[PDB]
Design a protein around this ligand. Structure first.
Ligand SMILES: Nc1ncnc2c1ncn2[C@@H]1O[C@H](COP(=O)(O)OP(=O)(O)OP(O)(O)=S)[C@@H](O)[C@H]1O
Lengths: 398, 172, 63, 127
């Protein structure tokens, strides 16, 4: 077997890597007790040179591997044209691991096991790379598609992937680059100038790829915009946008397929209206669906123990997870009532997009309760009314 | 530290008879101890005399009735020149500071002058029960280190052992 | 007035052969500063010499 | 005298790296000291002091701060050597002051990974 451990090193901490590894291994072997995360330490060095330690899926086993990472402080660099520096490309450039991305991989909650599939995909990619397999004989396009309902966190999973991969695979690539492509600023449309513009940003991608000691992730938002369905569209009125801008990207991406330290990640909204010659050039086209009842309950939990962690809900009552309610078998009791009422909200708040789910506490603490400090079961009631407030508001805008 | 201190006094007494040449250099040899090249001896009579010394000195080390156990360089007529005072409050990290004392001895007849608050009578009778050699109470001329240079050679406040050693010696 | 970092107008020192420590200059800053010293304790032996008591001398001499 | 003071700073820096078996007794300045046999370290400390050498040719100097680092390079200990820079017992007296300092105090992990500094005979330690 194997288990993974990740430890936040402070930027103002500068001790050597192997000392950090030895110290964390010492803490683990002394403690050696589930998936909980350490925050409390007992060594002045380790305190001033560590922020937290965490286990990612209660056992005293010693099959432990350490990944140590530094979330880079500064945000995005910008990419503009070479001689038309005003606005032509304007691509976003994250130098991973990055600060604004942490905690993101944990918060997201799905029910189709996208995380494991879409992570061990890259793991098997590296395995086949190091074993020297005949790239002429077994190959992959290094393109992963994610499509589904709007606001359901489709694109969130790609930044989480990139963060988790530049963290997990440290000391195998010093760092990673993540290029966020704006598929709306590359449509300067007068007689195939956009189809010529894709070329420049892809040469810059080549520039960031040849640095063979950096793992690069190219994240394309709205991959339906760049690749419009040319065949079924019975519109000859499309002069050269539907034929000389999709064909200007189906080549530059078949050109980076030969390299190995690149991965293409794409986010789509419309399943149709996309070129059939691009739904073959993607290894994984995984569908991100709207949250389901258990998922909704887990997200609502995350929110509520987040509020309790910041003391918003001052009287701390144990919120019982759905597994404990199944174990007891749905028995009403003086503490078990709150979880039950949460679960009734979960069925009643079914079918909403994850973004409004992660908003709903904001509104429920906005209009219905002005209290700077709130007791539970009134805040819960505020949620149970704010959800119906959201249904009626959606019905209001027709 | 009983074994540790015992072997330390062995290596000590060889360095003591070595560094100021009261005896010829060729008599003592060397081996390896405490990750330190140390000076040793194998001459029989001295070996057994020191042997009796150590297995007679261990119980003062355990019971702690000794304000300070001293090793004294003596002349052929018992004329002290250097006392080495173990001012000891004995109540993983200890042996390394004994490396430090080894260095210190390198940069610091004979007798084992045990400063106890009680009379040496119990210790004396004990010497003649773990040795044929009789122990006597130290006379006037074997204690007086006139003009003592009170320099503390090396102190250790170890949680296991409050140990401070120094050479009570004249101006030299 | 000047401090050197053999790793105020500061004259650091680099020795390019050693250059594993990816971030050097911030390491160099730490080495310079002062920070709270503990007092140099005037030391005292705990069990002093009382002249009214006489120690123990065994008879025998080395060969 | 600056040259021989720099050789005594050699004696200091490296014997204090000592004050384990990779170290050995040898004759320095007519005393036996138990340092390291490392020729790379020998010439490296010689280089440290001989780059300190023109510094003392300037004669403007305050301390030779032989920082005994921890393994973190973030000082949990230190050894400032504030010699107010303008027989064998006293050339050994300095070594006995530092030994009694590390006596009442304590050392650091085996590899002290120290980085000599200078601020341009007496001493103390910021623990
Ligand atoms: N399924 C989910 N589970 C938990 N949190 C979610 C989920 N989906 C979305 N979120 C939260 O939604 C916020 C942003 O989601 P987005 O990824 O921007 O949605 P999106 O899918 O990008 O929609 P598009 O395609 O860009 S309109 C993040 O803060 C996520 O935490």
């Amino acid at each position: 077997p194997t288990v993974h451990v990740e430890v936040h090193q402070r930027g103002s901490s500068t001790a050597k890597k192997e000392d950090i590894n030895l110290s964390v291994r010492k803490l683990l072997n002394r403690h050696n007790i589930g998936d909980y995360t350490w925050t409390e330490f007992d060594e002045p060095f380790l305190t001033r040179n560590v922020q937290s330690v965490s286990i990612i899926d209660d056992l005293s086993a010693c099959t432990v591997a350490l990944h140590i990472f530094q979330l880079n402080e500064d945000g995005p660099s910008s990419e503009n044209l070479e001689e038309e520096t005003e606005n032509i490309i304007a691509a976003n450039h994250w130098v991973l691991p990055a600060a604004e991305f942490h905690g993101l991989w944990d918060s997201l909650v799905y029910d189709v096991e996208v995380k494991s599939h879409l992570l061990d995909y890259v793991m098997t990619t590296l395995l086949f790379s190091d074993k020297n397999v005949n790239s002429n004989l077994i190959t992959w396009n290094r393109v992963v598609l994610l499509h589904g309902p709007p606001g359901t966190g489709k694109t969130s999973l790609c930044k989480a992937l990139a963060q988790k991969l530049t963290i997990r695979l440290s000391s195998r690539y010093r760092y990673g680059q993540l290029i966020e492509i704006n598929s709306h600023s590359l449509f300067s449309k007068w007689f195939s100038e956009s189809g010529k513009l894709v070329t420049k940003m892809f040469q810059k991608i080549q520039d960031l790829i040849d640095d063979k000691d950096a793992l690069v992730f190219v994240l394309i938002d709205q991959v339906e915009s760049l690749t419009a369905a040319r065949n079924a569209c019975r519109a000859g009125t499309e002069p050269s946008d539907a034929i000389r801008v999709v064909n200007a990207v189906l080549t530059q991406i078949d050109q980076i397929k030969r390299h190995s330290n690149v991965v293409i990640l794409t986010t789509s909204n419309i399943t149709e209206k996309i070129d059939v010659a691009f739904v073959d050039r993607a290894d994984i086209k995984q569908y991100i669906g709207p949250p389901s009842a258990a998922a909704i309950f887990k997200i609502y939990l995350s929110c509520l123990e987040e509020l309790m962690k910041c003391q918003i809900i001052y009287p701390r009552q144990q919120l019982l997870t759905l597994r404990e309610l199944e174990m007891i078998g749905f028995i009403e009791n003086n503490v078990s009532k709150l979880s039950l009422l949460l679960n009734d909200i979960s069925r009643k708040s079914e079918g909403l997009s994850g973004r409004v789910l992660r908003k709903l506490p904001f509104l429920a603490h906005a209009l219905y309760v002005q209290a700077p400090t709130v007791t539970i079961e009134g805040f819960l009631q505020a949620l149970s009314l704010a959800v119906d407030k959201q249904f009626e508001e959606r019905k209001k805008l027709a | 530290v009983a074994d540790v201190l015992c072997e330390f006094l062995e290596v000590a007494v060889h360095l003591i008879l070595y560094v100021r040449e009261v005896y010829p250099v060729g008599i003592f040899q060397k081996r390896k101890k405490y990750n330190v090249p140390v000076q040793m001896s194998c001459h029989p009579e001295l070996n057994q005399y020191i042997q009796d010394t150590l297995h007679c000195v261990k119980p003062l080390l355990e019971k702690n009735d000794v304000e300070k156990v001293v090793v004294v360089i003596l002349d052929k007529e018992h004329r002290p020149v250097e006392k080495f005072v173990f001012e000891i409050t004995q109540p993983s990290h200890v042996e390394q500071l004994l490396r430090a004392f080894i260095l210190k001895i390198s940069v610091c007849t004979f007798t084992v002058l045990v400063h106890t608050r009680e009379a040496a009578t119990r210790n004396m009778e004990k010497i003649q029960v773990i040795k044929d050699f009789p122990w006597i109470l130290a006379d006037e001329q074997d204690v007086h280190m006139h003009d003592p240079r009170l320099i503390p050679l090396k102190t250790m406040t170890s949680d296991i052992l409050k140990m401070q050693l120094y050479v009570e010696e004249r101006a030299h | 007035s000047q401090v050197h970092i053999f790793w105020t107008e500061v004259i650091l020192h680099y020795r390019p052969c050693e250059s594993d420590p990816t971030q050097l200059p911030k390491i160099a800053e730490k080495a310079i500063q002062d920070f709270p010293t503990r007092p140099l304790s005037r030391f005292i032996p705990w069990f002093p010499y009382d002249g009214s008591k006489l120690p123990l001398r065994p008879k025998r001499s080395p060969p």
